[PDB]
């Protein structure tokens, strides 16, 4: 309930500085996409900088692929 909502907020508060150091321009979007997955992987990404990089690099490619689809329309 509201406890899991606070858990999801604080996980974003821990992930955002690390992602902002990695990808500062689109840090807010990558944190929002990564926050959708289960919390078990989120706690692992904070302990391993390599696992965080893999999820962030996957998230940046997702936004890049969606921007091309949105540009193909108008």
């Amino acid at each position: 309930p509201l406890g899991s909502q606070e858990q999801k907020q604080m996980l974003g508060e821990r992930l955002f500085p690390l992602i902002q150091a990695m990808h500062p321009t689109l840090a807010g979007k990558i944190t929002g996409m990564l926050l959708e997955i289960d919390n078990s992987e989120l706690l692992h990404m904070l302990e391993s900088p390599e696992s965080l990089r893999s999820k962030v690099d996957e998230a940046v490619a997702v936004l890049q692929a969606h921007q091309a689809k949105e540009a193909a329309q108008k």
């Binding site: 907020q9 926050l35 959708e36 997702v62």
Partner: peptide, 20 residues
């Protein structure tokens, strides 16, 4: 493995949208 590009943006200090 599925990531949503339309996921709500996370801004520190304000409650995240799509919060269930």
């Amino acid at each position: 493995s599925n990531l949503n590009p339309n996921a709500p943006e996370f801004h520190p200090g304000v409650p995240w949208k799509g919060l269930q």
